[model samples]
Target chain A: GELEALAKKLKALAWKLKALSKEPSAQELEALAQELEALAKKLKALAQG
Target chain B: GELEALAKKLKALAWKLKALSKEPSAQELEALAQELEALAKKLKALAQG
Candidate 1:
Protein backbone atom coordinates (compact mmCIF):
# COMPACT_ATOMS: atom_id res chain seq x y z
CA GLY A 1 0.00 0.00 0.00
CA GLU A 2 2.93 2.29 0.62
CA LEU A 3 3.87 2.42 -3.04
CA GLU A 4 0.86 1.69 -5.17
CA ALA A 5 -2.30 1.73 -3.09
CA LEU A 6 -4.67 4.60 -3.78
CA ALA A 7 -6.28 5.83 -0.52
CA LYS A 8 -4.23 3.47 1.61
CA LYS A 9 -1.18 4.78 -0.17
CA LEU A 10 -2.16 8.30 0.77
CA LYS A 11 -2.71 7.30 4.38
CA ALA A 12 0.72 5.67 4.47
CA LEU A 13 2.22 8.68 2.78
CA ALA A 14 0.62 10.95 5.37
CA TRP A 15 1.65 8.74 8.27
CA LYS A 16 5.14 8.28 6.84
CA LEU A 17 5.39 12.02 6.76
CA LYS A 18 4.88 11.64 10.50
CA ALA A 19 7.05 8.65 11.65
CA LEU A 20 10.65 8.21 10.32
CA SER A 21 13.36 10.18 12.06
CA LYS A 22 14.70 8.18 15.02
CA GLU A 23 16.53 5.73 12.72
CA PRO A 24 19.37 6.05 10.28
CA SER A 25 18.88 6.96 6.64
CA ALA A 26 18.02 3.91 4.50
CA GLN A 27 18.66 5.77 1.15
CA GLU A 28 15.59 4.25 -0.46
CA LEU A 29 13.19 5.89 1.99
CA GLU A 30 13.56 9.31 0.41
CA ALA A 31 12.86 7.89 -2.99
CA LEU A 32 9.61 6.54 -1.59
CA ALA A 33 8.64 9.91 -0.18
CA GLN A 34 9.13 11.70 -3.45
CA GLU A 35 7.23 9.00 -5.23
CA LEU A 36 4.41 9.45 -2.74
CA GLU A 37 4.32 13.22 -3.17
CA ALA A 38 4.33 12.86 -6.92
CA LEU A 39 1.53 10.35 -6.76
CA ALA A 40 -0.28 12.51 -4.23
CA LYS A 41 -0.11 15.45 -6.61
CA LYS A 42 -1.16 13.21 -9.42
CA LEU A 43 -4.05 12.04 -7.30
CA LYS A 44 -4.86 15.62 -6.47
CA ALA A 45 -4.83 16.72 -10.10
CA LEU A 46 -6.38 13.49 -11.24
CA ALA A 47 -9.06 13.98 -8.65
CA GLN A 48 -8.82 17.66 -9.46
CA GLY A 49 -8.96 18.57 -5.80
CA GLY B 1 -5.27 -2.43 23.00
CA GLU B 2 -7.48 -1.48 25.88
CA LEU B 3 -10.95 -0.68 24.62
CA GLU B 4 -9.71 -0.43 21.04
CA ALA B 5 -8.10 -3.89 21.13
CA LEU B 6 -10.53 -5.91 23.25
CA ALA B 7 -11.09 -8.16 20.25
CA LYS B 8 -7.62 -9.63 20.91
CA LYS B 9 -5.63 -8.58 23.95
CA LEU B 10 -6.82 -8.46 27.56
CA LYS B 11 -4.14 -7.02 29.78
CA ALA B 12 -3.57 -3.35 29.08
CA LEU B 13 -5.37 -0.63 30.98
CA ALA B 14 -7.95 1.75 29.58
CA TRP B 15 -6.89 4.44 27.15
CA LYS B 16 -8.14 6.59 24.35
CA LEU B 17 -6.63 8.68 21.55
CA LYS B 18 -7.81 11.78 23.31
CA ALA B 19 -5.90 10.59 26.38
CA LEU B 20 -2.77 9.87 24.37
CA SER B 21 -2.89 13.21 22.67
CA LYS B 22 -2.44 14.71 26.10
CA GLU B 23 1.10 13.31 26.22
CA PRO B 24 1.99 15.44 23.22
CA SER B 25 1.07 18.84 21.92
CA ALA B 26 -0.31 19.71 18.47
CA GLN B 27 3.01 21.23 17.45
CA GLU B 28 4.76 18.15 18.81
CA LEU B 29 2.35 16.01 16.85
CA GLU B 30 3.81 17.65 13.79
CA ALA B 31 7.27 16.72 15.03
CA LEU B 32 6.51 13.14 14.16
CA ALA B 33 4.72 14.48 11.13
CA GLN B 34 7.88 16.34 10.07
CA GLU B 35 10.10 13.30 10.57
CA LEU B 36 7.83 11.16 8.43
CA GLU B 37 7.73 13.94 5.88
CA ALA B 38 11.51 13.73 5.54
CA LEU B 39 11.39 9.96 5.25
CA ALA B 40 8.82 10.24 2.50
CA LYS B 41 11.18 12.59 0.68
CA LYS B 42 14.02 10.09 1.05
CA LEU B 43 11.93 7.23 -0.31
CA LYS B 44 10.76 9.40 -3.20
CA ALA B 45 14.17 10.01 -4.76
CA LEU B 46 15.27 6.40 -4.44
CA ALA B 47 12.25 4.94 -6.24
CA GLN B 48 12.51 7.67 -8.89
CA GLY B 49 8.80 7.49 -9.64
Candidate 2:
Protein backbone atom coordinates (compact mmCIF):
# COMPACT_ATOMS: atom_id res chain seq x y z
CA GLY A 1 0.00 0.00 0.00
CA GLU A 2 3.00 2.30 -0.24
CA LEU A 3 1.77 3.62 -3.54
CA GLU A 4 -1.65 4.38 -2.12
CA ALA A 5 -0.03 6.03 0.87
CA LEU A 6 2.02 8.19 -1.41
CA ALA A 7 -1.08 9.02 -3.40
CA LYS A 8 -2.93 10.10 -0.30
CA LYS A 9 -0.03 12.20 0.89
CA LEU A 10 0.28 13.82 -2.50
CA LYS A 11 -3.44 14.56 -2.57
CA ALA A 12 -3.32 16.04 0.89
CA LEU A 13 -0.38 18.24 -0.06
CA ALA A 14 -2.21 19.36 -3.18
CA TRP A 15 -5.23 20.33 -1.12
CA LYS A 16 -3.06 22.21 1.32
CA LEU A 17 -1.55 24.22 -1.48
CA LYS A 18 -4.95 24.85 -3.02
CA ALA A 19 -6.26 26.10 0.30
CA LEU A 20 -3.58 28.77 0.51
CA SER A 21 -4.63 32.39 0.12
CA LYS A 22 -4.69 33.86 -3.39
CA GLU A 23 -1.55 35.86 -2.69
CA PRO A 24 0.57 33.68 -0.48
CA SER A 25 3.67 35.28 1.02
CA ALA A 26 7.19 34.38 -0.10
CA GLN A 27 7.83 32.71 3.23
CA GLU A 28 4.73 30.58 2.84
CA LEU A 29 5.73 29.64 -0.66
CA GLU A 30 9.24 28.74 0.51
CA ALA A 31 7.87 26.55 3.28
CA LEU A 32 5.52 24.72 0.96
CA ALA A 33 8.27 24.39 -1.62
CA GLN A 34 10.49 22.76 0.96
CA GLU A 35 7.74 20.32 1.87
CA LEU A 36 7.15 19.55 -1.76
CA GLU A 37 10.85 19.03 -2.37
CA ALA A 38 11.03 16.68 0.58
CA LEU A 39 8.08 14.75 -0.72
CA ALA A 40 9.69 14.53 -4.11
CA LYS A 41 12.84 13.14 -2.56
CA LYS A 42 10.82 10.56 -0.66
CA LEU A 43 9.08 9.60 -3.86
CA LYS A 44 12.38 9.24 -5.66
CA ALA A 45 13.70 7.03 -2.90
CA LEU A 46 10.58 4.91 -3.00
CA ALA A 47 10.85 4.57 -6.74
CA GLN A 48 14.51 3.52 -6.58
CA GLY A 49 14.00 1.03 -3.81
CA GLY B 1 16.74 18.28 -15.03
CA GLU B 2 14.62 15.15 -14.91
CA LEU B 3 13.32 16.03 -11.49
CA GLU B 4 12.46 19.53 -12.58
CA ALA B 5 10.68 18.15 -15.63
CA LEU B 6 8.63 15.86 -13.46
CA ALA B 7 7.86 18.73 -11.14
CA LYS B 8 6.60 20.83 -14.01
CA LYS B 9 4.52 17.98 -15.37
CA LEU B 10 3.03 17.36 -11.98
CA LYS B 11 2.23 21.04 -11.47
CA ALA B 12 0.62 21.25 -14.90
CA LEU B 13 -1.48 18.21 -14.03
CA ALA B 14 -2.58 19.80 -10.78
CA TRP B 15 -3.70 22.87 -12.67
CA LYS B 16 -5.59 20.72 -15.15
CA LEU B 17 -7.45 19.04 -12.32
CA LYS B 18 -8.15 22.41 -10.73
CA ALA B 19 -9.57 23.73 -13.97
CA LEU B 20 -12.21 21.02 -14.05
CA SER B 21 -15.76 22.11 -13.34
CA LYS B 22 -17.11 21.77 -9.83
CA GLU B 23 -19.26 18.86 -10.99
CA PRO B 24 -17.11 16.94 -13.40
CA SER B 25 -18.72 13.92 -15.07
CA ALA B 26 -17.80 10.37 -14.12
CA GLN B 27 -16.10 9.90 -17.48
CA GLU B 28 -13.97 12.95 -16.96
CA LEU B 29 -12.98 11.76 -13.52
CA GLU B 30 -12.19 8.31 -14.83
CA ALA B 31 -10.02 9.70 -17.60
CA LEU B 32 -8.12 11.92 -15.22
CA ALA B 33 -7.72 8.97 -12.87
CA GLN B 34 -6.11 6.98 -15.64
CA GLU B 35 -3.71 9.76 -16.45
CA LEU B 36 -2.79 10.06 -12.79
CA GLU B 37 -2.25 6.34 -12.52
CA ALA B 38 -0.02 6.45 -15.57
CA LEU B 39 1.99 9.27 -14.07
CA ALA B 40 2.37 7.34 -10.83
CA LYS B 41 3.66 4.38 -12.75
CA LYS B 42 6.13 6.58 -14.55
CA LEU B 43 7.32 8.04 -11.29
CA LYS B 44 7.75 4.54 -9.93
CA ALA B 45 9.74 3.58 -12.97
CA LEU B 46 11.94 6.62 -12.72
CA ALA B 47 12.60 5.94 -9.09
CA GLN B 48 13.51 2.35 -9.70
CA GLY B 49 15.95 3.29 -12.42
Candidate 3:
Protein backbone atom coordinates (compact mmCIF):
# COMPACT_ATOMS: atom_id res chain seq x y z
CA GLY A 1 0.00 0.00 0.00
CA GLU A 2 2.80 2.40 0.79
CA LEU A 3 4.39 1.72 -2.56
CA GLU A 4 1.24 2.17 -4.58
CA ALA A 5 0.25 5.25 -2.61
CA LEU A 6 3.65 6.83 -3.07
CA ALA A 7 3.76 5.89 -6.72
CA LYS A 8 0.41 7.52 -7.34
CA LYS A 9 1.46 10.51 -5.28
CA LEU A 10 4.58 10.83 -7.43
CA LYS A 11 2.45 10.78 -10.58
CA ALA A 12 0.42 13.70 -9.31
CA LEU A 13 3.57 15.56 -8.35
CA ALA A 14 5.04 14.87 -11.79
CA TRP A 15 1.96 16.30 -13.44
CA LYS A 16 2.24 19.39 -11.32
CA LEU A 17 5.88 19.74 -12.24
CA LYS A 18 5.03 19.49 -15.93
CA ALA A 19 2.63 22.38 -15.63
CA LEU A 20 4.51 24.12 -12.85
CA SER A 21 6.02 26.88 -14.99
CA LYS A 22 2.52 27.98 -15.90
CA GLU A 23 1.95 28.84 -12.28
CA PRO A 24 3.59 31.70 -10.44
CA SER A 25 6.34 31.49 -7.86
CA ALA A 26 9.34 29.42 -8.89
CA GLN A 27 10.42 29.29 -5.24
CA GLU A 28 7.44 27.17 -4.22
CA LEU A 29 7.83 24.89 -7.22
CA GLU A 30 11.55 24.55 -6.52
CA ALA A 31 10.75 23.50 -2.95
CA LEU A 32 8.19 21.03 -4.24
CA ALA A 33 10.72 19.66 -6.74
CA GLN A 34 13.20 18.97 -3.94
CA GLU A 35 10.53 17.28 -1.89
CA LEU A 36 9.48 15.23 -4.87
CA GLU A 37 13.08 14.16 -5.51
CA ALA A 38 13.33 13.00 -1.90
CA LEU A 39 10.10 11.13 -2.27
CA ALA A 40 11.39 9.57 -5.48
CA LYS A 41 14.49 8.35 -3.68
CA LYS A 42 12.35 6.80 -0.97
CA LEU A 43 10.28 5.06 -3.59
CA LYS A 44 13.40 3.74 -5.26
CA ALA A 45 14.59 2.35 -1.92
CA LEU A 46 11.19 0.78 -1.41
CA ALA A 47 11.52 -0.85 -4.81
CA GLN A 48 14.88 -2.34 -3.84
CA GLY A 49 13.75 -3.48 -0.42
CA GLY B 1 -11.30 6.27 -18.35
CA GLU B 2 -9.94 8.27 -21.25
CA LEU B 3 -8.82 11.05 -18.98
CA GLU B 4 -7.05 8.71 -16.61
CA ALA B 5 -5.45 6.83 -19.47
CA LEU B 6 -4.23 9.98 -21.14
CA ALA B 7 -3.01 11.31 -17.83
CA LYS B 8 -0.94 8.17 -17.39
CA LYS B 9 0.38 8.45 -20.90
CA LEU B 10 1.46 12.02 -20.29
CA LYS B 11 3.25 10.97 -17.13
CA ALA B 12 5.24 8.40 -19.04
CA LEU B 13 6.11 10.98 -21.66
CA ALA B 14 7.12 13.47 -19.01
CA TRP B 15 9.49 11.00 -17.40
CA LYS B 16 10.97 10.24 -20.79
CA LEU B 17 11.51 13.92 -21.44
CA LYS B 18 13.21 14.40 -18.10
CA ALA B 19 15.69 11.65 -18.89
CA LEU B 20 15.82 12.36 -22.59
CA SER B 21 18.50 15.01 -22.60
CA LYS B 22 21.04 12.45 -21.53
CA GLU B 23 20.50 10.57 -24.77
CA PRO B 24 21.77 11.74 -28.14
CA SER B 25 19.65 13.30 -30.88
CA ALA B 26 17.75 16.39 -29.85
CA GLN B 27 15.44 15.83 -32.78
CA GLU B 28 13.87 12.74 -31.25
CA LEU B 29 13.21 14.46 -27.96
CA GLU B 30 11.82 17.51 -29.73
CA ALA B 31 9.39 15.35 -31.67
CA LEU B 32 8.35 13.55 -28.53
CA ALA B 33 7.87 16.84 -26.72
CA GLN B 34 5.53 18.00 -29.47
CA GLU B 35 3.59 14.75 -29.32
CA LEU B 36 3.40 15.07 -25.55
CA GLU B 37 2.00 18.58 -25.84
CA ALA B 38 -0.71 17.38 -28.20
CA LEU B 39 -1.61 14.60 -25.81
CA ALA B 40 -1.68 17.04 -22.90
CA LYS B 41 -4.13 19.25 -24.78
CA LYS B 42 -6.36 16.29 -25.54
CA LEU B 43 -6.25 15.32 -21.90
CA LYS B 44 -7.25 18.82 -20.86
CA ALA B 45 -10.15 18.80 -23.27
CA LEU B 46 -11.32 15.45 -21.96
CA ALA B 47 -11.21 16.83 -18.45
CA GLN B 48 -13.43 19.77 -19.43
CA GLY B 49 -15.84 17.71 -21.48
Kindly report the docking quality category of candidate 3.
incorrect
Best by lDDT: 2
lDDT per residue (tens digit) for residues A1-49 in model 3: 5544554555675577556535535454445545545654553454345
The model with the greatest DockQ is: 1
Which regions of candidate 1 deviate over 4 angstroms?
A1-5, B1-49
Residue-level lDDT tens digits of model 2 in A13-47 = 55554544344455554555555556555545544
TM-score of each: 0.32, 0.48, 0.44
Per-residue lDDT tens digits of candidate 3, residues B1-49? 4434554665785565455434524455445545544654553444344
DockQ of each: 0.10, 0.06, 0.06
Model 3 CA lDDT for position B14: 50
CA lDDT of B49 in candidate 3?
Answer: 47
The digit string of per-residue lDDT tens for model 1 on A1-49 reads 1123343444454444334433324453554456545653543443332
Task: List ranges where model 3 is wrong by over 4 Å.
Answer: A1-49
Q: Encode model 2's per-residue lDDT on B2-23: one tens digit a residue.
A: 4345555566655554544343
